[PDB]
Structure 1
């Protein structure tokens, strides 16, 4: 299969909700080395969001059971071993994505929009490793923090405060501060400024992106309200 065939098979897999097939198609598209179009970029992001998402969801359930069964020895060991199995899958998925970002996506991102998208993505998949990492953690946390910080600097300089990629990055960096670093105030401060800056310049909303923009602002405020 050539690029166009793999992209078409990815769209079919998406419709069929076969996200492993979708991810394999887009992985192959990325390994051809050419810069991804906006469409291909979104197909890659959606595919892996769902592939890693099923493992993160399974991990959270099994971890909660493993915690809930402290007094039931047999059942807790069963839960622990299964959580570890899920973790190996989750790590392999994150390592696959971060390898694509480092080998192809980040070096070929010619425009600011793309660079911010892929650095945020790097920040995100290092954050998923950090969610399950328990001595390797500090290094993983630092790699997520460095990707997010670089993306944040470029977005504040090159993008309008209502751009969905700029808002989304502020949302996920904010989640990183709260969940991974346990800095609720630093998380709240980031989400609040992101929200207020966007409210002050709503005239900069594009018809092709206003739905994602307004959605992320609602999410930014939800996190601010929940962490307060």
Structure 2
């Protein structure tokens, strides 16, 4: 209960790596991780990996303006290694403790999605066997999330909806097949509409819409 508590301080402080540590500890200590716990843990990794992805994009872009290039390129390297470490950190934890114990629809989809997202982050920057094996692992985590979600969750559900959102960015960006992207996006949007009769869902439906108009306009 303590490490959770400690988790919220780190979060209040915006010291996210420490938030990770605490949340790792939390899971080993534990049985069925709770909704609160699972969310904290995810927020923590979300922010730690998020800061690296941002810096990585800003530097890659700089590297692009530039063609120095190898300074930039050494630097990106170091950021690239931090990336492997976090994705590494939370992936393992997903096999060992997280996924195996999932007792319910949402929970499996939630975790299977995380797993997808983290291989997805390995895929944005890796280049070799690693990119390939990351693209694949990704496709297959999303897909089994998809099979469960699309069958047990309401189309309006933040998880079904966030899955579809990330799943199709994978296509658009990693596999680089737009077509498959827009269809998955469009599909997930339309059947949320079929059932609109709130508020994490609402955002996500708009992000799908923005991605489509943006993928349509190339």
- Taking structure 2 as the reference length, what is the TM-score of the superposition? 0.97
- Report what 1:124 is aligned to: 117
Are 1:114 and 2:114 an aligned pair? no
- Report what 1:39 is aligned to: 36
Are 1:212 and 2:200 an aligned pair? yes
Deviant stretches of 4+, over 2 Å: none
Residue of structure 2 aligned with 1:161, choices 145, 155, 159: 155
CA distance in 1, matches of 2:82, 2:47: 13
Paired residue secondary structure (2:102) = coil
Are 1:227 and 2:215 an aligned pair? yes
- Report what 1:206 is aligned to: none
Please report how far the alpha carbon of residue 166 of structure 1 lies from its aligned counterpart in structure 2 after TM superposition. Answer: 0.2
Please report how far the alpha carbon of residue 33 of structure 1 lies from its aligned counterpart in structure 2 after TM superposition. Answer: 4.0
CA distance in 1, matches of 2:212, 2:179: 10
Please report how far the alpha carbon of residue 135 of structure 1 lies from its aligned counterpart in structure 2 after TM superposition. Answer: 2.2
**What value does the CA root-mean-square deviation take over the aligned residues?**
0.8
Paired residue secondary structure (1:211) = coil
CA distance in 1, matches of 2:18, 2:31: 21
Please report how far the alpha carbon of residue 65 of structure 1 lies from its aligned counterpart in structure 2 after TM superposition. Answer: 1.4
- Report what 1:140 is aligned to: 134
Please report how far the alpha carbon of residue 128 of structure 1 lies from its aligned counterpart in structure 2 after TM superposition. Answer: 0.2
CA distance in 1, matches of 2:133, 2:89: 18
Paired residue secondary structure (2:199) = helix
Q: Which runs of 5+ in 1 are unaligned?
A: 204-209
Paired residue secondary structure (1:128) = helix
Please report how far the alpha carbon of residue 69 of structure 1 lies from its aligned counterpart in structure 2 after TM superposition. Answer: 1.3
Count of aligned positions:
215
